[PDB]
């Protein structure tokens, strides 16, 4: 699982 | 920016 | 599963 | 921009 | 499944 | 632009 | 299935 | 523009 | 099936 | 323009 | 910036 | 598990 | 800055 | 377990 | 600055 | 166990 | 400054 | 056990 | 082969 | 509606 | 092969 | 709705 | 192979 | 909703 | 292989 | 919601 | 392999 | 929520 | 291997 | 909450 | 190996 | 809370 | 090895 | 609280 | 080896 | 409180 929010 | 890999 | 919102 | 791959 | 909205 | 491949 | 709306 | 292939 | 509207 | 092939 | 890998 | 908030 | 590895 | 707050 | 390793 | 606060 | 090793 | 406060 | 478009 | 059986 | 788009 | 069985 | 998008 | 079984 | 995105 | 079984 | 993100 | 079993 | 982040 | 069993 | 951070 | 068993 | 920090 | 058993 | 700091 | 048994 790999997640990113900017 | 919102991204997800599973 | 690969998803992206900008 | 909204994209999804499964 | 491959989908894109712009 | 709205596109879908299955 | 392949569909596109512009 | 609206197109569909099945 | 192949269809197009413009 | 409206076209259909089956 | 918010990111997570599992 | 690897996570980062900035 | 807040980060965690397990 | 490795964690850091700044 | 607050850090912990276990 | 190794911890530091500044 | 506050630090602890066990 | 090793601890230091300054 | 059996196909239908409506 | 677009459907195909082979 | 069995496919349906609505 | 887009579905495929093979 | 069985797939569905809604 | 996007689902796939193989 | 069994996958689902909602 | 994103889930995968292999 | 069994994974879930919510 | 992020979970993984192998 | 069994892991969980909340 | 971050947990791991191996 | 069994580890938990809260 | 940080705990580890090996 | 069994360790706990609170 | 910091504790260790080996 | 058994150690405790409070 | 600091204690050690070996």
From Swiss-Prot, chains A, B, C, D, E, F, G, H, I, J, K, L, M, N, O, P, Q, R, S, T, U, V, W, X, Y, Z, AA, AB, AC, AD, AE, AF, AG, AH, AI, AJ:
Superkingdom of source: Eukaryota
Coiled coil location: none
Compartment(s): Cell membrane; Secreted, Cell wall
Transmembrane spans: none
Changes after translation: N-glycosylated and O-glycosylated. The GPI-anchor is attached to the protein in the endoplasmic reticulum and serves to target the protein to the cell surface. There, the glucosamine-inositol phospholipid moiety is cleaved off and the GPI-modified mannoprotein is covalently attached via its lipidless GPI glycan remnant to the 1,6-beta-glucan of the outer cell wall layer.
Quaternary structure and partners: Forms homodimers through the tandem repeats. Aggregates in amyloid-like structures, with self-propagating secondary-structure changes, amyloid-characteristic dye binding, and induced birefringence.
Family stated for the protein in its record: Belongs to the ALS family.
Function recorded in the entry: Cell surface adhesion protein which mediates both yeast-to-host tissue adherence and yeast aggregation. Plays an important role in the pathogenesis of C.albicans infections. Forms amyloid structures, essential for cell-cell association and cell-substrate adhesion to polystyrene.
Domain notes: Each ALS protein has a similar three-domain structure, including a N-ter domain of 433-436 amino acids that is 55-90 percent identical across the family and which mediates adherence to various materials; a central domain of variable numbers of tandemly repeated copies of a 36 amino acid motif; and a C-ter domain that is relatively variable in length and sequence across the family.
Protein name per its UniProtKB record: Agglutinin-like protein 5
Primary gene name: ALS5
Range of the intact protein held here: 196 to 201 of 1419
């Amino acid at each position: 699982i790999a997640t990113l929010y900017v």
